[PDB]
Amino acid sequence: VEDWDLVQTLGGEVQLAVNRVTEEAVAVKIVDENIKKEICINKMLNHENVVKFYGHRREGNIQYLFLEYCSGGELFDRIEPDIGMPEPDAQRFFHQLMAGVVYLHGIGITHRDIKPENLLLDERDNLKISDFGLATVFRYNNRERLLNKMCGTLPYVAPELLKRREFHAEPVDVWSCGIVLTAMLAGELPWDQPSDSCQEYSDWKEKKTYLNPWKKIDSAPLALLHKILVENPSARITIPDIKKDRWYNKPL
Numbered sequence: 001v002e003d004w005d006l007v008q009t010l011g012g013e014v015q016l017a018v019n020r021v022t023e024e025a026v027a028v029k030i031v032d033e034n035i036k037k038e039i040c041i042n043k044m045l046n047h048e049n050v051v052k053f054y055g056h057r058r059e060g061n062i063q064y065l066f067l068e069y070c071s072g073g074e075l076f077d078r079i080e081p082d083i084g085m086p087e088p089d090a091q092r093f094f095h096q097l098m099a100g101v102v103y104l105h106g107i108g109i110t111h112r113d114i115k116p117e118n119l120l121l122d123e124r125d126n127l128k129i130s131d132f133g134l135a136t137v138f139r140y141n142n143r144e145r146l147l148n149k150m151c152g153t154l155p156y157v158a159p160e161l162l163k164r165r166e167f168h169a170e171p172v173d174v175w176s177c178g179i180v181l182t183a184m185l186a187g188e189l190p191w192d193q194p195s196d197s198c199q200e201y202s203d204w205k206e207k208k209t210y211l212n213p214w215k216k217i218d219s220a221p222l223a224l225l226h227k228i229l230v231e232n233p234s235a236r237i238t239i240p241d242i243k244k245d246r247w248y249n250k251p252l
């Protein structure tokens, strides 16, 4: 209830804010129904690996979202093109990515748009999941509801979403996570989209892993990926299973 400076715009606009009395820094979203849902979902969320939502003020027609500030920037910038990043660094971001994702699912919320751009790093380099503008509720009162709407980024998106009227929410999220894993370890994205028309996707389906980006990826990491980027969302590895994966538990 005290003045905030509005020092700079981080990323509708997002501008970093610092308190005059305390000097605490906050990320404030400036928005000039989707907004209402975003706030509604944020109220729900409390986790170390999910961005913290402080509050909202309705001013004029402008909506204010008070969110945790990540000095780290986005994970997107920690990947060198065509190289990615050290395997130890990737595993840790992935462990954190899984933690944030697991929490949302128990909570019954799916992000629906997981990408490096949406994964933020704090001062300690800890991963945070950012932006619930596309997020939705997939479990209420212990009953699941199938999703039929299409949203996300095409490279990150699951194959089922493209070819099916209705799909499970959780499996779509795991696929996006796997793709993020691929980028961290390869520095490049496998296909423009997960389609038979796309040549790169077909090769992966054919198992031609002697080609980029698979060639860059180590065999242990790759084995996990084979399990994650499985076209049948029903046969796709689950998060509990990811934890049991050998690479996932490999000391690096």
Ligand SMILES: c1ccc2c(-c3cnc4cnc(-c5cn[nH]c5)cn34)c[nH]c2c1
Binding pocket: 010, 011, 014, 027, 029, 067, 068, 069, 070, 071, 072, 073, 074, 120, 130, 131
């Ligand atoms: C450098 C440093 C911080 C950020 C951010 C940033 C830092 N903290 C937040 C919090 N929320 C957002 C955000 C929320 N919705 N859309 C973006 C972006 N942040 C985005 N891009 C950056 C580049």
